[PDB]
Amino acid sequence: SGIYYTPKIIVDYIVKKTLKNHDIIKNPYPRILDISCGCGNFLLEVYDILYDLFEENIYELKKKYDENYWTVDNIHRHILNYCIYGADIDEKAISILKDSLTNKKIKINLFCCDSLKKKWRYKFDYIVGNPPYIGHKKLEKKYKKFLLEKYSEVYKDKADLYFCFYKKIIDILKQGGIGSVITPRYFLESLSGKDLREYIKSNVNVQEIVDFLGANIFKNIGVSSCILTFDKKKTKETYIDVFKIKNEDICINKFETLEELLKSSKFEHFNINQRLLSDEWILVNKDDETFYNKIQEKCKYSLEDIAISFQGIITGCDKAFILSKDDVKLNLVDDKFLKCWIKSKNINKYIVDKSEYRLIYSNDIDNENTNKRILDEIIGLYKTKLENRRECKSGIRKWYELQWGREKLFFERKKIMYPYKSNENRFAIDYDNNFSSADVYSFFIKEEYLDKFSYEYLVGILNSSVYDKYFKITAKKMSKNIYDYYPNKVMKIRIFRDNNYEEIENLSKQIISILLNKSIDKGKVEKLQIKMDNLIMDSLGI
DNA sequence: TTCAAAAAGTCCCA
DNA sequence: TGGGACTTTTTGA
Ligand SMILES: OC[C@H]1O[C@@H](n2cnc3c(NCc4ccccc4)ncnc32)[C@H](O)[C@@H]1O
Ligand SMILES: [K+]
Ligand SMILES: [K+]
């Protein structure tokens, strides 16, 4: 496949947003383009809107211009000759769209091509549509070479194709033109989006951002969506209207139009000064802005200053190396090769569940002839798969070695761990030398900062409600009740030390002591957490 | 030599 | 089919 249907409410909102206040009398030849038209979800609606626009002013146009040209009977043809433009890579979609535009009642400006390679011969008044989203794993590598060569200002490292579509749209937009598109929301906060953000802020005035957060706009699609509207007008003041959803549980058809949704109690509205955006786009209301600025100002250190961070093991084929601790095959493996192994769901606040899995740290198997039983009966079962790994085909790793085995000495110590995707802050102290995959991240404290910061104090403040809200201010929202907890944002969290250090650390130690008992009652832990939150709010003056 | 980012997620049930 | 639990390894740098 490859063609995705956009909900009609979204299409109507986008077309109306671009064409609401067009002066058809002053310009009866607007050029309106969709470079991912597909079957023409947007373009057919553009035809309807334009037909009403032209018919409403047919006699005014007849008087101001050639009176024989401007007839209702001539509207259709005119629309299809000078106004509607579409491009797509699929021949069948273009043929279907051409048939529909013909049946609305002549040369139709429909192109079957790759929009990122087409030499565009003129700019456009209005651009709308839904571009393709393809990530770094699902993109062919020759095409990635092309993108890296030609779209270097926005496409780099782990970036996405729709970054290039943003750049192309911006480049072929007329002065005073208006663009409105629906894309994934991740570029707003992702590390890969940085350059793209810089390209937008520097080249268009951003009118409006609609952030649906984790709501499901596309049925049976695992993606989170936003709508962006921007222009190239001579702007005096550059202020952005931000509509952020307040309940991800909504159904999009709650009203006849998206405008009713935006103005209702289901959304929140606020304004952001485009001139005040840094390389990061902190899009929050004034209360959250004050909260964030207080926290940033009062804190002297960051986690990056005082800690060393790392990503977990990447075996390359988990079924070959990970076994249940009760699996009989572990009798074939010397215990010097076995490590405790945990998943992201084993990380609670302040402590980790006990391990249920073992990792065969196969890097320390010297010769294949020694311990050949392990290679024959456990790892070799997936040998074919293991040989398709990149470092095996290139020869850097033997077929039975872990793909990215990291350094054991970093794991086999006291450290703090957190899951890579979570609904809330879950920072735990690891006491058991646990190993994990890339779905859990770790850090430990630098030696020179041990006397300023203990592990108990850090898990105490990082697990608080204050720091939950503070981290989620700028965190990358992925899907319903899921944020990314990656070092590129976690290590930028700022921390403090003051008169309340000792009581916070003591409360943290009490919480840890309760959580490790045979008969845990979480209630006193909740009360202690409330008291610690009061201490933190006192320290930060919020 | 070897790090860390990346949801048109994935999979399964009522 | 829609909603909830949970999260691998490929890949550029
Ligand atoms: O998904 C939304 C619609 O977008 C279309 N579309 C996807 N990639 C496109 C492209 N260049 C990118 C490209 C990437 C790899 C190979 C060729 C082209 N140029 C034009 N249209 C493209 C799909 O057919 C859908 O109808
Ligand atoms: K006339
Ligand atoms: K979603």
Q: Can you tell me the distance from the alpha carbon of A160 to that of A167, in angstroms, rounded to the nearest whole number?
A: 12
Question: Which of A35, A94, A114, A139 has most ligand 1 atoms within 8 Å of CB, for mutation?
Answer: A114
User: Which amino acid does the sequence have at A126?
Assistant: Y
Would you say the CB of residue A34 lies under 6 angstroms from ligand 1? no
Task: Give the number of other CB atoms < 10 A from CB of residue A172.
Answer: 19
Residue nearest the C1' of C6 (CA based): A345
Q: Can you tell me the distance from the alpha carbon of A222 to that of A148, in angstroms, rounded to the nearest whole number?
A: 26
Would you state the structure tokens that stand for residue A111, as one six-digit string?
């192109």
Q: Can you tell me the distance from the alpha carbon of A386 to that of A317, in angstroms, rounded to the nearest whole number?
A: 7
| Backbone φ and ψ of A219, nearest 5° | -60, 135
Closest nucleotide to the alpha carbon of A187, via C1': B6
Would you state the structure tokens that stand for residue A450, as one six-digit string?
């041990």
Q: What is the 3-state secondary structure (H, E, C) of A84-115?
A: EEEEECCHHHHHHHHHHHHHCCCCCEEEECCC
How many Å does it take to go from CA A401 to C1' B11? Answer: 29
Residues 117-136 of A with CB under 7 A from strand B: 130-136
How many Å does it take to go from CA A426 to C1' C9? Answer: 24
CB-strand contact A410/B, under 7 Å: no
Protein residue closest via CA to atom 19 of ligand 1: A114
| Backbone φ and ψ of A146, nearest 5° | -60, -50
- Measured in angstroms, the resolution is 2.6
CB-strand contact A328/C, under 7 Å: no
Protein residue closest via CA to atom 15 of ligand 1: A143
Would you say the CB of residue A529 lies under 6 angstroms from ligand 1? no
Closest nucleotide to the alpha carbon of A438, via C1': C8
Question: What is residue A204's three-state secondary structure?
Answer: coil
Would you say the CB of residue A38 lies under 6 angstroms from ligand 1? yes
What are the Cα distances from residue A364, in Å, to A314, A367, A434?
16, 9, 18
Residues 151-180 of A with CB under 7 A from strand C: 156-158
A229-252 b/e with 16+ CB inside 10 Å = b?
A: bbbbeeeeebebebbbbeeeebeb
Would you say the CB of residue A3 lies under 6 angstroms from ligand 1? yes
Protein residue closest via CA to atom 11 of ligand 1: A114
Residue corresponding to tokens 């549980």: A249
Q: Can you tell me the distance from the alpha carbon of A38 to that of A36, in angstroms, rounded to the nearest whole number?
A: 6
Ligand 3 (ion): residues with CB under 5 Å are A 216, 224, 479
Q: Can you tell me the distance from the alpha carbon of A313 to that of A437, in angstroms, rounded to the nearest whole number?
A: 5
Q: Which residues of A are annotated as a binding site for S-adenosyl-L-homocysteine?
A: 4, 6, 88, 114-115
Whether residue A182 contacts residue A215, with contact meaning beta carbons closer than 8 Å, is answered with no
Residue corresponding to tokens 């646990």: A434
User: Which amino acid does the sequence have at A41?
Assistant: N
Q: Is A494 exposed, middle or buried (0-12, 13-18, 19+ CB in 10 A)?
A: middle
Residues 142-171 of A with CB under 7 A from strand B: 158, 160
Closest nucleotide to the alpha carbon of A420, via C1': C7
CATH superfamily, domain at A7-130? Vaccinia Virus protein VP39 (3.40.50.150)
A437-464 b/e with 16+ CB inside 10 Å = b?
A: beebbbbbbeeeeeeebebbbbbbbbbb
Question: What does the domain layout of chain A look like in residue ranges?
Answer: 7-130, 305-540
Residues 455-514 of A with CB under 7 A from strand B: 476, 478-479, 482, 484, 486-488
Method by which the coordinates were obtained: X-ray
Protein residue closest via CA to atom 8 of ligand 1: A132
Whether residue A219 contacts residue A472, with contact meaning beta carbons closer than 8 Å, is answered with no
CB-strand contact A192/C, under 7 Å: no
Would you say the CB of residue A116 lies under 6 angstroms from ligand 1? yes
Task: Give the number of other CB atoms < 10 A from CB of residue A349.
Answer: 19
Phi-psi map region of A350: left, alpha, beta (phi>0 left; psi -120 to 50 alpha): left
How many Å does it take to go from CA A260 to C1' C3? Answer: 26
Residue nearest the C1' of C2 (CA based): A220
How many Å does it take to go from CA A404 to C1' B3? Answer: 10
Question: Which of A4, A33, A89, A172 has most ligand 1 atoms within 8 Å of CB, for mutation?
Answer: A89
Q: Can you tell me the distance from the alpha carbon of A523 to that of A71, in angstroms, rounded to the nearest whole number?
A: 77
